[PDB]
Amino acid sequence: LDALETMAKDNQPIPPRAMILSGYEVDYMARYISEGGLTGERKRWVPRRGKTPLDPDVEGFIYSNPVETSFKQRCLEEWKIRHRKLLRHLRNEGPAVLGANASESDY
């Protein structure tokens, strides 16, 4: 969000390449006229399991030579993982002074 506020100050919009992701039919029948699996024989829609030292996902577009890690649906990660900082101090002896209390077993 902090990044998005910074682009809105002077920059032009979020790049279209930065916007790519994998009731109603999620298998649409409507998109497949606009990416290649259509009347045009150039079926540019993504296949899968092509082997080779290439990328079968998109991971952005092609770049970032490592692999993309999976954020779980914008759910549990980096909030339970941030909390390790709170737990770091309590599991560490020297960084904590506290007071006298019950010797060194309160915290």
Place this chain on the structure above:
Amino acid sequence: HGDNKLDFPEANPDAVLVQKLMAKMLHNGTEAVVMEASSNELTHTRCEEIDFDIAVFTNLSRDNSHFQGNEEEFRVAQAKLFSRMVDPDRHRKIVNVDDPNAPFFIAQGNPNVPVLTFALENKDADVHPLKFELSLFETTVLVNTPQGILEISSGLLGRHNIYNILAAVTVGIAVGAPLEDIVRGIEEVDAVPGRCEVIDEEQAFGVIVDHARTPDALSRLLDSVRELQPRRIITVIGSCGEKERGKRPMLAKVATDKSDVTMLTSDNQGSEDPLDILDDMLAGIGWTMQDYLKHGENDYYPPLPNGHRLFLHDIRRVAVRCAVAMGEEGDMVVVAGKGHEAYQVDGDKKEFFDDREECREALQYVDELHQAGIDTSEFPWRLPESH
């Protein structure tokens, strides 16, 4: 004549070949011919010099609308068969009053030629099956022909097949043929080539194939199966030859909606790679094959939309072998997709391959299949002593 088959040429040659084979019929001991009034045949200035004895109208449906741009052209061009009629004393009209435009079809030329009607749901017909019963392996028809009421018992399933038998007996009535000869002719055929070919090699699951060049054919067979409700439903789905990618979405939709477990194969893919063809199989209805990417021994047990089962394979031989191998007791085992096509093409290959022969062979190896068969339902199959 008899049982010899002169090699079937392309869909429709010119009238030179037609009249050559007609001379063969005339001077080879034959005294009649059953001619299919194809749209291309009547369109290409052919019926002008053909004397038609009996014109039959079995069923009507809307297809190939690109050629028949308007329903008026479809109803008039197809009515040229009835317009050729000129003598209402040696010629007869067999009409389907079950369809709505039966009088409309009749009125397009010489209505004096008499009208004999067949209809099952519409009992107001000259020939009507007063009693109709259809099962997976049994079929009973008490039909009140103009001669009288007759019992027809056969394993040739299909409600449209009952309509077809009704049309046949009506045609026999047109020439005044006896009911016994009509029954003899009906029972003279037990498996029409490559269409609705029931195979029963000591099994309780009905092997059946159809032409299946359009998704509506699979849809119709699925509705017939619904009318003939078996225990478990498996349908092996072929592919599409050229870049007609708009059919397989709705095809897989009706399959997965009406089949507890589905199956796919690689029947005709002469255009592209089989992997891409298998990818295209799901393109318009609601499920994405990206899960097929992330299997990892964890996605092998999915329950597609309606909790039904997923399906994937390419080797046709193993595909049909496992399809016949699924049949446990009294279930539905469709392995259709091409019909009478006695070969197999995968992009750039041509070899011998018959679906019916492999089906009967698999029914034979069912005896070996009885030695194992744990973990049957979805995936995987055929390998015991690994749990």
